[PDB]
Design a protein around this nucleic acid. Structure first.
Lengths: 51, 237, 99, 56, 99, 134
RNA sequence: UGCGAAAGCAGUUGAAGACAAGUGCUUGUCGUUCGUUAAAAUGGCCU
C-alpha cells in the first residue's frame, strides 16, 4: 500500500474511487491500531499478574 | 554442582615494592601518594586503559584500597581512587559500603555510579529512592536497569518501603526512558493491593497525556521518514 | 527460558555446559555467570561459602571452554585465563593483547 | 478477558507457571502488540495522502 | 585464441592514439602467414551506441572461428555481434540482459 | 488578528529577526489559519528554510513538550510542503533534520512501555472500583 | 568508511594527465596515474 501511495499519489486528486478506497483503508488501519494498543495494555496487565 | 567450590585439596612492576612505597608515604599526602603510585604503574591516563593488564591482580587492589582508606579517612581522596573506580577488577567486598563513604564527594560519587563495577542493588535503589534528587537520578536508573535483572529490581522494590515509593511517584508525576521503565517496575512491585486513589488518578492522567504526546511524536517521526483543449498564452516576438 | 530483562546489548556471548548437565556457564559482555540447569536460574548455595556464581572480568569474554568438570578457559580481549572451578582459583593467565 | 484478570487477579498471582498455563493468551497478545509500529507508519503515510488530496 | 589454437585475436588500445576509432582488433594466424586482419572497432560498433552508455561500447568477451571467418564480440550491455571478417558485416544477437 | 500575525511573521522573516519563533509560538494561530498560511503566504525558499530551522530547533530542544502548536506546524509543513524541503540541500538543514530525527526517535520505543503502564493503571482503577463498590 | 546491539554514533570521495563533444574557451569521459580510512542496443531461464 505504501508503494502504491508513493507511485500513484497524484492520481488520487483526479480519481474519486481511489480516494474512497484510501479512506476506507484508513478507517480499517485505525481499528487495527486500536486493537494492537488494547492487546499491548492487556499484555502489561498480564505482566503485572505474572510477576 | 555440589562439588563446586568445596575442594579439600589446596611491563612488569614490583607490586610489593609499590605497596611498601605507598605505606612509607605519609598520611594525608594525596599528591605524594598519587605521584608515587602513578610513577610505579607508569601509565599516563587517569582512567583505566586497555594497556595495563598486569595491575589487575586482586591483592594489589585490596592492599592499595585499604591503604587509601586508612591514609585519607579524613583527608581528601587522591586520583588513585578515581583510577581504581575506573578499574574493572574492583574488589567485591568494598562495594558494600563504597557509596556511603563517597557520598560526601559528588565527583567521586558520580564516578563510582557511572564506572565502578558491582555496586549492590540495595544501596543503588536506596540512593535512587532517596529524596535528594540531585540530578544523578538518571545515572542511577540507567545503572540499575542496565546491570540488574528486572525480577531482582522488582524484588528489591518489594523490600523498599511504601512511602519512598509514593514520593518517587509524585516526583515523576510532577516531572525519561529509564524513568518509565522504573515506573513500570514500581507498579509491578506495589502490585494489586496498595495504591491510593488520588495518587492513582493523577498517575493515570499523567500516563494518558504522555501516551498522547508519544503517539504524536511517532507521527512526526514517520512524517520525516515519508493537455487542455483551449489554452490562451502570451507570445513575445 | 531465562528472560533478558536488560537494557544491556552486547555481541560478546559464549556458553559452556557441564558434561553431567548440571551447570551452564554464560559469558555475556564482561560478566560470567554459573547457572543451575534444573532451575534454569543463577546458582545459589545454601551454605553460601566460597561459592561465587558470578565472575567479573577485565574485558569482554570471547570464548568459554569447559575442558573437564574442573578446568574453565576464558578468553577475553586482553587475557586468556584458566580457572579451576573446584578450587575457585585462577591457575594461570596469558597475555593475548599484542595479538 | 479483562474482567477475568481484574476479578481473579489474586488467584492468578498465587498460581505458578502462569506463562505455561496462559501460553495461548501470551502469544495471541504478542502478535497484535508486535504489529503496532508498522501500522503507525502506514497510518502516517495515509494521513499524508489523504490530507494532500483533501486540501487539493 | 581459437579452439584449434592456430588463430589469435586481440583488441588493443593503440588505435586511440593512432586512429579515429578508439581500439583496434587484430586477427593473426600463429603457425603460418595465411590470416592477418586489423580493423578499427568503430566500423564494428553500431551508429546507435555513441549516444548510449559506455556499456554499449565496452568489449567484455571475444571468440574467433577455427577457420577464421567469424569473430564474435560480446559486450557489457549483453549484446553479441558476429562479424564476418572477410566483409566486416555484423549480425546482432540479443538475449543477455547483463554482461 | 490572524492577518496581523501573518504580516508580522513575514516582516520578521524578511528582517531575519528572532521574533519569528515567538510569532509561531503565539496562541493566535488556529489550525485552519495555519493551513491557510502554509497554502498561500509562503513563497520564499529562504523564508521557508528559516521557519523550518527555527521550528526544528525548538522541537529538538524539547521533544516532550506539552504544547501542540509547533508540532502541528511541523506536521502540516511536512504534509503539504515537503518537495521543496527536499530540494533545499543545505548542510546545516540536513544536520538539523538529523538532530530532529534523533530527538523524535526515542518516543517510538517509549510507546509500548507507556501502553503497558496504562493497562496496569486501568486494572488498578477497576480493582479499586470493585473494592469500593462491594 | 571507522566503531557499535539491530538502534545508531562520528567521518568522507581530493587532485593530475589524456581524450571526446560544443564553441582559444566550456563541458563530459577514463580496460590512466597519485592521494584520503571513505538505469535505458525490444534485450528474462531448455526438453
Amino acid at each position: 500500500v505504501a508503494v502504491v501511495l508513493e507511485l500513484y499519489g497524484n492520481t488520487l486528486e483526479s480519481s474519486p474511487v481511489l480516494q474512497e478506497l484510501m479512506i476506507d483503508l484508513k478507517t480499517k488501519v485505525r481499528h487495527e491500531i486500536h486493537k494492537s494498543k488494547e492487546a499491548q495494555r492487556i499484555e502489561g496487565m498480564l505482566q503485572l499478574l505474572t510477576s | 554442582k555440589d562439588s563446586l567450590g568445596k575442594s579439600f585439596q589446596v611491563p612488569v612492576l614490583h607490586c610489593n615494592e609499590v605497596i611498601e612505597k605507598l605505606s612509607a608515604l605519609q598520611d594525608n599526602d594525596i599528591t605524594s601518594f598519587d605521584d608515587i603510585f602513578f610513577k610505579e604503574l607508569k601509565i599516563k591516563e587517569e582512567h583505566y586503559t586497555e594497556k595495563d593488564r598486569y595491575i589487575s591482580d586482586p591483592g594489589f587492589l585490596n592492599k592499595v584500597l585499604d591503604l587509601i582508606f586508612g591514609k585519607f579517612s579524613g583527608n581528601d581522596y587522591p586520583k588513585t581512587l578515581t583510577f581504581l573506580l575506573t578499574h574493572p577488577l574492583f574488589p567485591l567486598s568494598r562495594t558494600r559500603n563504597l557509596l556511603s563513604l563517597l557520598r560526601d564527594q559528588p565527583r567521586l560519587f558520580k564516578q563510582a555510579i557511572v564506572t565502578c563495577p558491582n555496586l549492590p542493588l540495595n544501596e543503588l535503589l536506596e540512593e535512587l529512592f532517596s529524596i535528594r534528587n540531585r540530578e544523578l537520578l538518571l545515572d542511577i536508573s540507567f545503572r540499575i536497569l542496565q546491570d540488574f535483572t528486572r525480577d531482582s529490581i522488582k524484588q528489591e522494590m518489594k523490600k523498599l518501603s511504601k512511602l519512598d515509593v509514593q514520593n518517587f511517584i509524585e516526583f515523576i508525576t510532577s516531572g525519561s526512558t529509564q524513568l518509565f521503565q522504573l515506573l513500570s517496575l514500581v507498579l509491578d512491585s506495589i502490585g494489586l493491593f496498595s495504591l491510593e486513589g488520588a495518587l492513582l488518578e493523577n498517575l493515570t492522567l499523567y500516563i494518558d497525556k504522555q501516551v498522547e504526546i508519544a503517539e504524536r511524536n511517532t507521527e512526526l517521526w514517520n512524517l520525516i521518514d515519508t493537455l487542455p483543449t483551449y489554452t490562451m498564452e502570451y507570445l513575445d516576438i | 527460558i531465562s528472560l533478558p530483562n536488560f537494557n544491556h546489548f552486547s555481541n560478546s556471548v559464549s556458553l559452556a555446559w557441564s558434561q553431567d548437565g548440571s551447570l551452564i556457564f554464560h559469558g555475556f559482555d564482561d560478566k560470567l555467570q554459573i547457572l543451575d540447569f534444573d532451575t534454569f536460574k543463577k546458582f545459589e548455595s545454601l551454605e553460601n561459602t566460597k561459592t561465587v556464581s558470578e565472575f567479573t572480568l577485565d574485558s569482554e569474554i570471547q570464548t568459554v571452554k569447559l575442558i573437564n568438570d574442573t578446568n574453565l578457559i576464558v578468553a577475553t580481549r586482553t587475557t586468556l585465563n584458566a580457572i579451576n572451578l573446584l578450587r575457585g582459583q585462577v591457575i594461570n593467565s596469558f597475555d593475548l593483547y599484542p595479538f | 478477558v479483562k474482567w477475568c484478570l481484574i476479578i481473579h487477579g489474586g488467584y492468578l498471582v498465587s498460581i505458578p507457571n502462569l506463562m505455561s498455563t496462559l501460553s495461548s493468551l501470551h502469544s495471541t497478545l504478542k502478535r497484535r502488540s508486535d504489529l503496532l509500529p508498522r501500522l503507525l507508519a502506514l497510518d502516517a503515510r495515509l494521513d499524508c495522502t489523504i490530507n494532500k488530496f483533501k486540501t487539493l | 585464441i581459437s579452439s584449434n589454437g592456430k588463430l589469435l585475436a586481440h583488441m588493443c588500445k593503440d588505435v586511440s592514439t593512432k586512429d579515429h576509432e578508439h581500439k583496434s582488433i587484430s586477427v593473426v594466424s600463429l603457425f603460418d602467414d595465411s590470416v592477418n586482419l586489423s580493423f578499427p572497432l568503430g566500423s564494428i560498433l553500431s551508429s546507435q551506441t555513441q549516444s548510449l552508455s559506455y556499456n554499449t561500447r565496452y568489449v567484455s568477451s571475444m571468440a574467433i572461428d577455427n577457420m577464421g571467418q567469424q569473430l564474435a564480440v560480446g559486450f557489457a550491455s549483453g549484446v553479441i555481434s558476429i562479424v564476418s571478417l572477410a566483409d566486416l558485416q555484423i549480425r546482432l544477437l540479443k538475449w543477455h540482459i547483463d554482461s | 488578528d490572524q492577518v496581523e500575525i501573518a504580516n508580522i511573521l513575514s516582516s520578521h522573516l524578511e528582517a531575519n529577526s528572532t521574533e519569528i519563533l515567538d510569532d509561531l509560538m503565539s496562541g493566535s494561530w488556529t489550525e485552519p489559519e495555519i493551513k491557510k498560511f502554509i497554502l498561500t503566504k509562503i513563497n520564499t525558499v529562504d523564508h521557508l528554510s528559516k521557519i523550518f530551522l527555527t521550528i526544528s530547533k525548538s522541537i529538538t530542544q524539547n521533544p516532550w513538550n506539552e504544547e501542540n502548536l509547533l508540532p502541528l506546524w511541523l506536521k502540516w509543513l511536512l504534509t503539504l510542503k515537503s518537495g521543496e524541503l527536499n530540494s533545499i540541500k543545505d548542510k546545516h538543514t540536513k544536520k538539523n533534520c538529523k538532530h530532529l530525527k534523533s530527538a523524535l526517535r526515542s518516543s517510538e520505543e517509549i510507546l509500548p512501555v507507556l501502553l503497558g503502564i496504562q493497562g496496569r493503571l486501568e486494572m488498578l482503577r477497576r480493582q479499586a472500583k470493585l473494592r469500593e463498590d462491594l
